[PDB]
């Protein structure tokens, strides 16, 4: 973990020392989890808050942010948290995670290719750095601290008190936690269908290790554990070469060997695919495997040609007999392999969104190969595809009818929504407001959707700890977690949202059973705030904060 230490990029905004003239000693205060504090300006806190009061269920993860700002050098700034105690009972401080909220270069408003102008760029607080044990802060700088309390499941309900000690070579901040009588199940038991596409090739490139070696998997374990502890349900698999035509910094390579032998037979080898899938299942991501893609963005299919001992490409489009023959041959081998492994029922062939013609022709092919193959799609609403798609994810702008949703729930199908570079808000860009990430989970509860999908968990740019920009899209679009298995503010807020989606579900189960129709109509009145057309009437921060309080009263 010493090799995981790093330096931030230079701040493109210079520090005005006159703005710091009024700061006479180092300051410390509780801040808000809704705010990313600027590095180069004093915290906008005009008198310090020494106490923080939190409420949570047993089993819940709950966070707070403190801020330190200093007109002099602070050597070896450290945070530590006491045990929390309530009479003779204790939440042990092993369950409490601290991190420095570190800075990354971002830009602004979001689709299409970009030239970064470094004139348009700024440092923003986003990285939860729980690895570096101390930081030295330069004079005239501000530094956030993130505190995560993982409340154990067997914790006694009641009032817990504890201390956050900040040192540099001070103050104590007070932490109060009301633990309620209700229990939140562990992440492995959450209903919420979270899908954040994984990029293992980004990790092998960043650390310069052999793909799918022991070192590669050792590096991925804590990183993918971040996804599984957020309720991650879906394994991403690239079953061919460059499903997305190298749109990310690191292209996805094939996890399947496509070897066309010189006698006309094919040898398909799934060694990589199998290792990746088994690895992710051992971490608790086991609900679904999504296989990309039969319809890549460029319709050119790589295979290893033995006769010439080289890579070749079939150029073939859905609706062609050649496309049908090429995919039938692989999909029928793949079907047998999956059935041998016991993964067939959960494996989905996964599309991205194309002219209607294309998608139906691709579907014919899949069905000829095996009638029971499951299929998924993230794209636009089409009535034509509602009975064929076992997992259907729709743009936030479009809606399924309530009858469509129940028909799909009745049939055992998954129904979700996504955002990407199209939507200014809500989103998980590095300059997005933190509460927008939590908002996304509340929106799923409002819509009776099964969850939320985003296209990039960890498709890291070149220097993801320093600069979140990319040659396409708004900064942060390509990843939500960082090298070192470091979380972001964005993923932490999303996880709080998902925990509340589970609370709502548990509360409605209890209220329906007891005939408490009033409590149900109130939860639904509160859920009305999470409409994507109503964000100028009620800000995402305000909606999220009001809704949290309502659910916690029950």
Ligand X SMILES: CC(=O)N[C@@H]1[C@@H](O)[C@@H](O)[C@@H](CO)O[C@H]1O
Contact set with ligand X (CB under 6 A): 244, 247, 352, 378, 418, 420-421, 455, 473, 477
Residue 94 binds to a second copy (criterion: CB under 8 A): no
SS3 state at 424: coil
Tell me which of 304, 323, 452, 511 binds a second copy, using CB under 8 A: 304
User: Which of these, 53, 29, 31, 47, lies nearest to 175 by C-alpha position?
Assistant: 53
- Complex with Cl ion: residue 298 or 549, whichever CB lies closer: 298
Q: Residues 192-231: x/- map of binding to Cl ion (CB under 5 A)?
A: ----------------------------------------
Question: What Cα–Cα distance (Å) separates residue 494 from each residue in 227, 453, 499?
Answer: 11, 12, 9
Nearer to Cl ion, 252 or 455 (CB): 252
8 SS3 class: coil
DSSP assigned state of 185: P
Which of the stretches 162-170, 252-260, 329-337, 403-411 binds a second copy when contact is defined by CB under 8 A?
252-260
Distance CA 37, CA 540 (A): 18
Interaction of residue 267 with a second copy, rule CB under 8 A: yes
- Tell me which of Cl ion, ligand X, a second copy, none is bound by residue 307, counting a contact when its beta carbon lies within the kind-specific cut-off of 5 to 8 angstroms: a second copy
Rule CB under 5 A: which of 251-290 touch Cl ion? Answer: 251-252
272 makes contact with a second copy (CB under 8 A): yes
CB 74 within 8 A of CB 129: no
| Nearest-approach distance from CB 316 to a second copy, in angstroms | 17
Residue 536, CB-side half-sphere exposure with 13 Å CA sphere: 2
3-state SS assignment for residue 508:
helix
254 forms part of the interface with a second copy (CB under 8 A): yes
Beta bridge partners of residue 314, listed in sequence order: 301
Measured from the CB atom, is 254 or 293 closer to ligand X? Answer: 293
Annotated binding residue at 524? no
Return the one option of ligand X, a second copy, Cl ion, none that residue 473 interacts with (CB less than 5 to 8 A, by type).
ligand X
Residue 251 contact partner, candidates ligand X, Cl ion, a second copy, none, CB within 5 to 8 A by sort of partner: Cl ion
Q: Exposed, middle or buried: residue 404 (CB in 10 Å: 0-12, 13-18, 19+)?
A: middle
For residue 364, the tally of other CB atoms under 10 A from its CB is 12
Using rule CB under 8 A, residue 150 touches a second copy: no
Least separation in angstroms between CB 301 and a second copy: 13
Q: Which of 147, 146, 176 is nearest to 36 (CA)?
A: 146
250 labelled ligand-binding? no
CB of 306 to a second copy, least distance (A): 6
Q: Is 337 in the site for a second copy (CB under 8 A)?
A: no
| 109, 262, 397, 411: which one binds a second copy (CB under 8 A) | 262
What tokens appear for 430 in the block?
């590095």
466 annotated ligand-binding residue: no
- 280 Rama sector, left if φ>0, alpha if ψ -120 to 50, beta otherwise: alpha
76 versus 269: smaller Cβ distance to a second copy: 269
119 sits in which H/E element: none
Distance (Å, rounded) from C-alpha 507 to C-alpha 520? Answer: 9
DSSP 188-256: GG---EEEE---HHHHHHHTT--TTSHHHHHHHHHHHHHHHHTTB-EEEEE-SS-TTTT-SSSPPPPSS
| Interior/surface letters 48-82, b for 16+ CB within 10 angstroms, e for the rest | eeeebebebbbbbbbbbbbbbbbbeebeebebebb
Residue placing its CB nearer to a second copy in the complex, 250 or 361 = 250
1 annotated as ligand-binding: no
Among 48, 170, 307, 322, binds a second copy (CB under 8 A): 307
> Nearest distance from residue 246's CB to Cl ion, in Å?
5
**Interacting partner of 352 out of a second copy, Cl ion, ligand X, none (Cβ under 5 to 8 A depending on kind):** ligand X
d(CA 77, CA 166): 7
What distance in Å separates the CA atoms of residue 131 and residue 122, rounded to the nearest whole number?
24
Whole-number minimum distance, CB 510 to a second copy, in Å?
48
- Strand-pairing partners, residue 105, are 123, 467
Q: Pick one of a second copy, Cl ion, ligand X, none as the site partner of residue 310 (Cβ within 5 to 8 A by kind).
A: a second copy
With CB under 5 A as the contact rule, the residue among 100, 244, 343, 460 that binds Cl ion is 244
**Site of interaction with a second copy (CB under 8 A):** 210-213, 241, 253-255, 257, 259, 261-263, 267, 269, 271-272, 275, 304, 306-311
Please enumerate, by residue number, every residue annotated as part of a binding site for N-acetyl-D-galactosamine.
247, 352, 421, 477
**Site of interaction with Cl ion (CB under 5 A):** 242, 244, 246, 251-252
């Amino acid at each position: 973990q010493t090799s995981e230490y790093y330096q931030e990029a230079a701040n493109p905004i210079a520090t005005n020392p006159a703005l710091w003239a009024k700061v006479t000693a180092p300051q410390i205060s509780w801040g808000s989890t809704d705010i990313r504090y600027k590095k180069e300006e004093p915290a906008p806190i005009h008198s310090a808050q020494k106490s923080m009061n939190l409420t949570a269920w047993k089993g819940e993860k709950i966070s707070a942010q403190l801020v330190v700002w200093t007109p002099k050098v602070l050597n070896d700034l450290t945070f530590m948290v006491s045990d929390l105690t309530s009479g003779s009972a204790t939440i042990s401080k092993e369950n409490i995670r601290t991190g420095f909220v570190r800075y990354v270069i971002t830009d602004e408003l979001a689709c299409g290719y970009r030239n970064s102008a470094d004139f348009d760029s700024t440092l923003v607080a986003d990285v939860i750095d729980h690895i570096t044990p101390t930081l030295t802060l330069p004079a005239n700088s501000t530094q956030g601290g993130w505190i995560s309390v993982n409340i154990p499941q067997g914790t006694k309900a009641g009032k817990y008190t504890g201390t956050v000690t900040v040192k540099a070579d001070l103050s104590e901040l007070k932490l109060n936690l009301q633990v309620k009588n209700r229990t939140l199940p562990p992440p492995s038991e959450w209903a919420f269908h979270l899908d954040l596409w994984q990029n293992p090739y980004a990790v092998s490139r960043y650390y310069n290790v052999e793909p799918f070696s022991k070192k590669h998997f050792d590096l991925m374990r804590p990183l993918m554990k971040l996804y599984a502890d957020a309720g991650g349900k879906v394994i991403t698999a690239s079953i061919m070469h460059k499903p997305w035509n190298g749109q990310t910094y690191d292209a996805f390579e094939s996890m399947v060997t496509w070897l066309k032998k010189a006698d006309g037979t094919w040898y398909f080898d799934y060694t990589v695919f199998d290792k990746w899938v088994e690895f992710m299942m051992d971490l608790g991501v086991k609900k679904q495997i999504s296989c990309y893609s039969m319809v890549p963005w460029r319709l050119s299919f790589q295979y290893f040609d033995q006769a010439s001992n080289s890579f070749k490409f079939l150029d073939a489009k859905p609706g062609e007999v050649a496309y049908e023959e090429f995919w039938m041959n692989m999909l029928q081998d793949f079907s047998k392999h999956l059935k041998a492994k016991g993964w067939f029922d959960i494996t989905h062939i996964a599309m991205d969104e194309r002219p209607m013609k294309d998608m139906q022709e691709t579907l014919k092919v899949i069905r000829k190969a095996d009638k029971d193959f499951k299929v998924s799609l993230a794209g636009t609403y089409h009535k034509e595809l509602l009975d064929d798609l076992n997992d259907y994810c729709i743009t936030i702008a479009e809606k399924f009818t309530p009858e469509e949703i129940e028909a799909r729930r009745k049939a055992g199908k998954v129904t979700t929504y996504y955002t990407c570079c199209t939507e200014p808000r809500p989103n998980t860009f590095t300059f997005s407001e933190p509460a927008e990430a939590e908002w996304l989970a509340w929106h799923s509860a409002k819509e009776n959707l099964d969850g939320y999908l985003r296209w990039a968990l960890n498709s890291w740019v070149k220097n993801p700890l320093q600069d979140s920009r990319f040659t396409a899209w708004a900064a942060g679009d390509t990843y939500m977690i960082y090298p070192g298995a470091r979380s972001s503010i964005r993923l932490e807020r999303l996880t709080e949202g998902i925990q509340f989606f589970e609370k709502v579900r548990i509360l409605k189960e209890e209220f329906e059973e007891k005939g408490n129709k009033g409590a149900i109509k109130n939860i639904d009145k509160t859920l009305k705030m999470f409409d994507e057309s109503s964000m100028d009437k009620i800000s995402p921060t305000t909606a999220v904060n009001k809704a949290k309080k309502v659910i916690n009263r029950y």
